């Protein structure tokens, strides 16, 4: 979601765009601004919700030693979804 400011520079994961009246935009002259186009705010939202059967369940990142220390969530809330602080994977209870 790299969307250009009215000045012309690009926006990062975080709004950090140097203002129009800033002197520290020279450094991109005859140069450019390395900015990652793949915002994790959105890619994680482009990910479905695992409608699991149990109320307390586990998350990893595809491999117990390959990421995400194994934490457990309480899926009593039917309104909101339970998420792990490490990934942003969502879950539900199905009942």
């Amino acid at each position: 979601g790299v969307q250009v400011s009215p000045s012309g520079e690009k926006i990062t994961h975080t709004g950090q765009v140097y203002d129009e009246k800033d002197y520290r935009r020279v450094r991109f002259v005859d140069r450019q601004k390395e900015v990652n186009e793949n915002f994790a705010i959105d890619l994680i939202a482009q990910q479905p919700v695992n409608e699991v059967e149990h109320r307390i369940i586990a998350c990893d990142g595809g491999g117990g030693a390959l990421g995400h220390p194994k934490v457990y969530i309480n899926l009593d809330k039917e309104t909101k979804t339970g998420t792990c602080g490490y990934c942003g994977l969502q879950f539900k209870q199905h009942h």
Binding site: G64, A65, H68, P69, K70
Partner: protein
């Protein structure tokens, strides 16, 4: 060893250079190779074996008439007796563990800190704070190839230390560059420095 240990030039360029006698090396504090090259039988693997060197058979090359060619041979030949030890350290290696089996001094396995809690806590403390050694002080003198590499730790209950101090074998050998460079000229003083196994990191610290 063919190319050097039988010439004239190498044998007429190093010989009778640096004839630092026995009892003056100790007054100067060499302790590594600039004293066993003069006949002082001394080594901290036959006298003070610290890691597995008790059950490691080898020979300590000693040389009389220590003159920058007799210690050369003591230096070419402990490359052999160390190449002899590889024959041992490769053959006998027990199928055991690799770090201390004490998770408050040696962090746990990178997969053991993803099932279990405590392993994750100690991981979160070992690699932030440390492990709180007790107060004390030591002197681990180790035979690096230069010699008695020393470390005078001084601990406190903190996870940081309180004044380490490093014994550079070379901080004493380079001070021997004054008496060994007596009678000898510009073209063989350049050879004395290489017959002290000089490295200007350990010293200049």
């Amino acid at each position: 060893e063919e190319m050097l240990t039988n010439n004239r030039i190498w044998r007429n360029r190093t010989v009778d250079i640096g004839v630092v006698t026995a009892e003056d090396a100790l007054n100067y504090g060499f302790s590594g190779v600039m004293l066993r090259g003069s006949g002082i039988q001394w080594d901290l693997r036959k006298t003070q074996p610290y890691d597995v060197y008790d059950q490691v058979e080898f020979d300590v090359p000693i040389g009389s008439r220590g003159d920058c060619y007799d210690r050369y041979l003591c230096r070419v030949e402990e490359m052999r007796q160390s190449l002899r030890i590889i024959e041992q350290c490769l053959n006998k290696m027990p199928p055991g563990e690799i770090k201390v089996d004490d998770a408050k001094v040696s962090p746990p396995k990178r997969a053991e800190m993803k099932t279990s809690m405590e392993s994750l806590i100690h991981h979160f403390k070992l690699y932030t704070e440390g492990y709180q050694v007790p107060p004390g002080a030591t002197y681990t003198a180790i035979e690096a190839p230069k010699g008695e590499f020393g470390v005078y730790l001084v601990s406190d209950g903190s996870s940081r230390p309180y004044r380490c101090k490093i014994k550079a074998p070379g901080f004493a050998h380079l001070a021997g560059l004054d008496k060994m460079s007596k009678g000898h000229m510009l073209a063989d003083v350049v050879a004395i420095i290489g017959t002290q196994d000089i490295v200007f990191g350990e010293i200049d610290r």
